[PDB]
């Protein structure tokens, strides 16, 4: 069950070392965004930030205050605001960051906060011993979207390329590679058959059924804009 905190943020524990959060933010709509907190030896990795510095700060102070862990590491799913909206603040805090080189390039060109270390295929970051396996498997929701796998926990943060089970629509495709998306999802499904929890960019987490569900939405979209 979730524990609600300030700045419209709630957090759920999935394992002794892994938590997933939902931060609600107002858009153009009060939209919910997801991220993860991974903790090992009182050090924490933040996977995606809430949309702004303020919510990010509240979240980071809570991890320090209640989870007794210092956020030292950060990894965003892609360049959108629900992934790097609070990166400015993380950098002032001195947090170390890793991201798809594509994400770094898009962030730079757009004048957005820029992650430090860039990878192009796979990267395994050791959070003082606990592995965070990041993978770029192709474009989808965003051209630079990655996924983060926690092998010791069997938990996958698929990010925005994955939709929750109650979703019916494709959503914002302004930055998507629509035809690559189903292919990226097949790769993700083939690579992480053991996933216990699969967390999407928005909505409720579930299991590997979200991958196939998301593939149906995307393929349905492609089918519906093909026709005469």
Catalytic residues: 78, 80, 82, 141, 160, 163, 172, 202
| Coil, strand or helix at 102 | helix
If you ran DSSP here, which 8-state letter would residue 206 be given? B
Q: In this structure, is the dihedral angle defined by the CA atoms of residues 119, 44, 51 and 3, taken in order, positive or negative?
A: positive
Closest to 185 in 3D by CA, of 197, 198, 196: 198
80 labeled binding residue: yes
**Considering beta carbons, is residue 80 or 215 the nearer one to Zn ion?**
80
Site of interaction with Zn ion (CB under 5 A): 80, 82, 160, 201
Among Zn ion, Na ion, none, what does residue 80 contact (CB within 5–8 Å per kind)? Answer: Zn ion
Among Zn ion, Na ion, none, what does residue 35 contact (CB within 5–8 Å per kind)? Answer: Na ion
**Considering beta carbons, is residue 24 or 64 the nearer one to Na ion?**
24
Closest to 199 in 3D by CA, of 3, 41, 13, 34: 34
If you ran DSSP here, which 8-state letter would residue 180 be given? T
User: Which run of H or of E encompasses 222?
Assistant: helix 209-224
Site for Na ion in 36-65 (CB under 5 A): 48
**Considering beta carbons, is residue 54 or 222 the nearer one to Na ion?**
54
160 labeled binding residue: yes
Residue 129 in tokens = 């011993």
Annotated binding site for Zn(2+): 78, 80, 82, 141, 160, 202
Binding-site residues, in ranges, read 78, 80, 82, 141, 160, 163, 172, 202
């Amino acid at each position: 069950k979730s524990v609600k905190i300030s700045d419209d943020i709630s957090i759920t524990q999935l394992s002794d070392k892994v938590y997933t959060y939902v931060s609600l933010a107002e858009i153009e709509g009060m939209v919910p965004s997801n991220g993860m907190i991974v903790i090992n030896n009182h050090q924490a990795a933040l996977l995606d930030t809430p949309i702004n510095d303020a919510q990010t700060e509240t979240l980071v102070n809570w991890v320090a205050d209640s989870l007794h862990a210092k956020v030292t590491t950060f990894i965003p799913n892609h360049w959108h605001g629900d992934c790097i909206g609070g990166l400015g603040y993380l950098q002032k805090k001195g947090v170390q960051s890793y991201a798809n080189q594509m994400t770094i390039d898009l962030a730079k060109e757009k004048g957005l906060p820029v992650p430090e270390h860039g990878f192009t295929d796979s990267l395994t970051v050791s959070l003082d011993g606990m592995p965070l396996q990041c993978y770029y498997l192709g474009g989808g929701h965003a051209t630079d979207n990655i996924v983060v796998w926690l092998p010791t926990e069997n938990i996958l943060f698929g990010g925005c390329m994955l939709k929750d089970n109650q979703a019916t629509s494709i959503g914002n495709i302004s930055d998507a590679d629509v035809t690559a998306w189903p292919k990226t999802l097949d790769k993700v499904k083939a690579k992480f058959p053991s996933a216990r929890y699969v967390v999407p960019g928005h909505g409720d987490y579930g299991g590997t059924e979200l991958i196939e569900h998301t593939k149906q939405i995307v393929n349905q979209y492609i089918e519906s804009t093909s026709k005469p």
